[PDB]
From a paper:
With all this information in hand, we could improve the resolution of our cryo-EM data, using an alternative GINS-expression construct, which omits the Psf1-B domain, and served to improve detail around the predicted interaction region. The resultant map showed a volume of extra density that allowed a short helical element to be incorporated into our model, consistent with the AlphaFold2-Multimer predictions. The hydrophobic side of the amphipathic GINI-core helix can be seen to pack across two helices of the Psf1-A domain, making interactions with the side chains of Leu490 and Leu491 of the GINI region and Val47, Lys51, Ile59, Ile62, Lys63 and His66 of Psf1. In addition, the side chain of Tyr494 in the GINI region is inserted into a small pocket on the surface of Psf1 formed by Tyr40, Asn43 and Leu69 with the hydroxyl group picking up a hydrogen bond with the side chain of His66. The GINS interaction surface in BRCT4 consists of residues found at the edge of the central four-stranded β-sheet, with additional interactions made by residues in the loops connecting the strands, including amino acids in the variant region between strands β3 and β4. Together, TopBP1-BRCT4 binds to the A domain of Psf1 and involves the linker region located towards the B domain. To our knowledge, this represents a novel mode for a BRCT domain-mediated interaction. In BRCT4, the interaction surface involves a region around beta strands β3 and β4. This region diverts from the canonical BRCT fold in that it lacks an alpha helix (α2)44 as if to create space for GINS binding. TopBP1 residues Val590, Thr606 and Val610 appeared to be involved in the interface, providing a series of direct hydrophobic interactions with the side chains of Trp92 and Ile97 in Psf1. Consistent with published Y2H experiments, our structural data indicate that the GINI core helix region interacts with both Psf1 and Psf3, at a position close to the distal end of the Psf1 A domain, whereas BRCT4 interacts with both the base of the Psf1-A domain and the linker that connects it to the B domain.
Residue numbers in the entry:
A (entry chain C): 1 to 195
B (entry chain D): 21 to 223
C (entry chain A): 1 to 145
D (entry chain B): 1 to 175
E (entry chain E): 484 to 497, 550 to 741
């Protein structure tokens, strides 16, 4: 059979994050730009470069641009109290979505974000008119890269695949590893080494 | 009713368990009958490797059957352990009459696994956490079974009027018919009752 | 920043080669627990000031700290849970006694959990097949020559 | 499930042997076998044939379909057709491996048979690759594959199912 | 309106012996294996085969452990076996740390310059403790002395290991200001390969 140990699968692409997934936690630790809509007292010590002077009880002034982890923004994001406003990261804007529509195989997904798909899917929890376009771009990129993933996974023995594998997302790397494991098992069986 | 049919059913359950993404219905009668057959055969074997070239083959068949049995039970244990909270919650709310997916021993196993893990989590961190962060909902913290997973199947009995839903656009939904002997690929959830009833076989 | 030690713990556990059990990082866990306690006390004080002094403008900030607490909690549980899976794999790979080098990396509670797991598994196996039991962990590979 | 369990299931296929000894018919839990008579063909499971061959207590006969000419025409038929053709048996790869590894003295041109079977396997894996590519590119939800063998499906099914799961998640995340 | 109120409420302050039992025996020499099987049979136990189709109640292994490839009920050592036979009682393996394999860092001799005497230990227990002490490099002398004596070949003792308050050697160590420590100190030193802090494990603190 398979190895007794299996990593907990990611739930990032579903409606809610997977509570116990290490990949989901690593994805949720990435920082994203936010804008403060209300002043937040006593937080200047944690945002020192934003500590307006020193006589406002280290309040975070209104309109301050901060980098906050995804989990914290999700926890504080309330459409009614409007504590903070979320800005789209550069890689999700129209230009980069157009680059993905042009050719998804040229982009180093690991370099841009080790959890590109999970993070993009979780960004859709914020109300934005572009959610459908983001989902479509993610799907089209996945479809565009699947064929190359298959070609490399099935021919990795005959071609240097290190450059491509170094650029793969963590879920994509796991999929590649599973395919390689299957291929290795078949090859060992054909030579009688499987037993 | 014949031993050959018993072994075929055993292999059927083994394959279905290997490929089904969730825990399937329990088949106690099959395990029981196979264990009885093995006990009997082991009893009717002597010990003299000389002219008894029939025991040197009966024990081989016994080992092959034991291997299939062990593999099937291991797969069932792996699935029971992986999703234990959702399996226990589903068994708790299982309507009377529908076939259960767990034997009494498997239920005991799941209960003990749950209790042990809860005790470990409580003693190692929960008691050292703030008073308002000591209760962790296990039903939500643990991933649920993915019933929307694709699988391969082998048609044993012809089936008709199967509704295929490509996506959320009802306009794309269409009907298909499954002919006896054919092999298909489809989401488990769409054909779950056919696997439960035994009309189809997971490749 | 909040939750850095938990993130280091998760990164260390994630980086370990498949099936290897790294040493239990107790210090990081203690530091995370102390940070959580400090945040709890700060939120308690701020809620007391908001209620007694009518400083409701502090209520969103309190929520900020509350969210951080949940993050720490999640990370801690996730860390421990991942370790459990590796211990389970060891049970299936080495048998009833683990090599000493791997044994040295375990906490006492992990040892207790492992013992309870093996106990339950043995009881289950004895419960199968009537009087003689069936060892299903043997012949992991087909008896084929 | 790994390839070793697929070969284990393949070991059930019946083959014809030539015993060189006598023995009363045995009543296996799986079926009756025999009687055995020197020089008289008997039908026994492949694993039993292999076991007896190692013990040098019989002669292995190659299946009627295991013929370089027939296999070459089957390979050419599979190559000319765009779809998967019906295979002689559902476990051809395992029977070829086992017979060529344990009965090369009884099978003429074993190397050529091995090359033909490897070529057929390569062409079917390539056709399965193109089929999966067409299935994914059109975002289809159903596909027929009656002629595909258990060994190939087991070899690539965890990858194909993980890819389909990811495609389903991305396709239904707008809710 | 209910979530904010719940949040604020979250912070509010207010005859047969081994009859029905199965044993595996692994890791011993052929002679010792046969001897152990013979003792088991003499005590009504049953010995199972390698690659057995059934599970074993117990796997009997050496004191330092060995490879145990099969699932068993509880893993026990030959020290546990001998202690059970001497007292005709099936002791819980968890009731004593010497009943299960003790992890030892191979190749380390942290007590090579130490001189140990034991008190209140007899039979298999004393034998196993002496084996472990020698494995860690210490010399074990039957007699407890504070000054070396070339003529009798005895060296002054550096450590007393015991279990309870009381006895001649304990009182002598107190009078002579010698450390009297529990077995846990030795087991932790073996586990770590470094001489444990006696002051953390003193018998007076147990």
């Amino acid at each position: 059979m398979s190895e007794a140990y299996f990593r907990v699968e990611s739930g990032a692409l579903g409606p809610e994050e997977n509570f116990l997934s290490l990949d989901d936690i690593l994805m949720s630790h990435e920082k994203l730009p936010v804008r403060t809509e209300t002043a937040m007292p006593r937080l200047g010590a944690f945002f020192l470069e934003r500590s307006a002077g020193a006589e406002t009880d280290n309040a975070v002034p209104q309109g301050s641009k901060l980098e906050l982890p995804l989990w914290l923004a999700k926890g504080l994001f309330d459409n009614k109290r409007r504590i903070l406003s979320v800005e789209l990261p550069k890689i999700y804007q129209e230009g980069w979505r157009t680059v993905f529509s042009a050719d998804p195989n040229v982009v180093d997904l690991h370099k841009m974000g080790p959890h590109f798909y999970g993070f993009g899917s979780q960004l859709l929890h914020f109300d934005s008119p572009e959610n459908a376009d983001i989902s479509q771009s993610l799907l089209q990129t996945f479809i565009g890269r699947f064929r190359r993933i298959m070609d490399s996974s099935q021919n990795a023995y005959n071609e240097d695949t290190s450059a491509l594998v170094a650029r793969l997302d963590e879920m994509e790397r796991g999929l590649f590893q599973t395919g390689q494991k299957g291929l290795n098992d078949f090859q060992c069986w054909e030579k009688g080494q499987a037993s | 009713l014949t031993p050959a049919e018993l072994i075929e059913r055993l292999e059927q359950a083994w394959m279905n368990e290997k490929f089904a993404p969730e825990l399937l219905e329990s088949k106690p009668e099959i395990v029981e009958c196979v264990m009885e057959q093995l006990e009997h055969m082991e009893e009717n074997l002597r010990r003299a490797k000389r002219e008894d070239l029939k025991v040197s083959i009966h024990q081989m068949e016994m080992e092959r059957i034991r291997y299939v049995l062990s593999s099937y039970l291991r797969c069932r244990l792996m699935k029971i352990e992986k999703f234990f909270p959702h399996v226990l919650e589903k068994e708790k709310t299982r309507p009377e009459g529908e076939p259960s997916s767990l034997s009494p021993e498997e239920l005991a196993f799941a209960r003990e696994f749950m209790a042990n893990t809860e005790s470990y989590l409580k003693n190692v961190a929960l008691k050292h956490m703030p008073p308002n962060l000591q209760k962790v909902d296990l039903f939500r913290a643990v991933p649920k079974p993915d019933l929307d997973s694709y699988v391969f199947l082998r048609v044993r009995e012809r089936q008709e009027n199967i509704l295929v839903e490509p996506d959320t656009d009802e306009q794309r939904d269409y009907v298909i018919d499954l002919e006896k002997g054919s092999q298909h690929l489809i989401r488990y959830k769409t054909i779950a009752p056919l696997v439960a009833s035994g009309a189809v076989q997971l490749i | 920043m909040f939750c850095e030690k938990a993130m280091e713990l998760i990164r260390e556990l994630h980086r370990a080669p498949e099936g290897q059990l790294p040493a239990f990082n107790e210090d990081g866990l203690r530091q995370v627990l102390e940070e959580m306690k400090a945040l709890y006390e700060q939120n308690q004080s701020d809620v007391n000031e908001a209620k007694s002094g009518g400083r409701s403008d502090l209520i969103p900030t309190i929520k900020f700290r509350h969210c951080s607490l949940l993050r720490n909690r999640r990370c801690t549980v996730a860390y421990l849970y991942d370790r459990l899976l590796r211990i389970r794999a060891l049970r299936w790979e080495y048998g009833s006694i683990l090599p000493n080098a791997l044994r040295f990396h375990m906490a006492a509670e992990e040892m207790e959990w492992f013992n309870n797991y093996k106990r339950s598994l043995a009881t289950y196996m004895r419960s199968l097949g009537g009087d003689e039991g069936l060892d299903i962990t043997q012949d992991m590979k087909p008896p084929k020559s | 499930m790994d390839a070793a369990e697929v070969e284990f299931l393949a070991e059930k296929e019946l083959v014809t042997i030539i015993p060189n000894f006598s023995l009363d018919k045995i009543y296996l839990i799986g079926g009756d076998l025999g009687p055995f008579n020197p020089g008289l063909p008997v039908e026994v499971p492949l694993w039993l044939a292999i076991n007896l061959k190692q013990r040098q207590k019989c002669r292995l006969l190659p299946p009627e379909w295991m013929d370089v000419e027939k296999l070459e025409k089957m390979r050419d038929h599979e190559r000319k057709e765009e779809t998967f053709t019906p295979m002689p048996s559902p476990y051809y790869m395992e029977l070829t491996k086992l017979l060529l590894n344990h009965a090369s003295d009884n099978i003429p041109k074993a190397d050529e048979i091995r090359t033909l079977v490897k070529d057929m396997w390569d062409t079917r894996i390539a056709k399965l690759r193109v089929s999966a590519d067409s299935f994914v590119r059109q975002q289809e939800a159903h596909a027929k594959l009656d002629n595909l063998t258990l060994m190939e499906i087991n070899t690539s099914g965890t990858f194909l199912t993980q890819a389909l799961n990811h495609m389903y998640k991305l396709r239904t995340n707008l809710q | 309106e209910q979530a904010d109120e719940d949040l604020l409420s979250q912070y509010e302050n207010g005859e047969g012996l081994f009859s029905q039992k199965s044993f595996l025996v692994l890791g011993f020499s052929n002679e010792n294996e046969s001897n152990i099987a013979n003792i088991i049979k003499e005590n009504a136990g049953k010995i199972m085969s390698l690659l057995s189709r059934t599970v074993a109640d117990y796997a009997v292994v050496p004191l330092l452990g060995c490879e145990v490839e099969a699932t068993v009920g509880e893993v026990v050592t030959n020290t546990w076996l001998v202690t059970c036979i001497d007292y005709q009682t099936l002791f819980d393996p968890k009731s004593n740390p010497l009943f299960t394999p003790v992890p030892v860092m191979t190749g380390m001799t942290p007590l090579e310059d130490c001189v140990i005497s034991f008190s209140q230990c007899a039979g298999a227990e004393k034998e196993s403790l002496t084996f472990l002490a020698n494995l860690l490099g210490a010399s074990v002398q039957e007699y407890f002395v504070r000054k070396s004596n070339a003529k009798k070949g005895m060296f002054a003792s550096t450590h007393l290991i015991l279990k309870e308050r009381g006895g001649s050697k304990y009182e002598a160590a107190k009078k002579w200001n010698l450390p009297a420590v529990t077995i846990a100190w030795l087991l932790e030193t073996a586990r770590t390969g470094k001489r444990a802090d006696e002051s953390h494990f003193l018998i007076e603190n147990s």
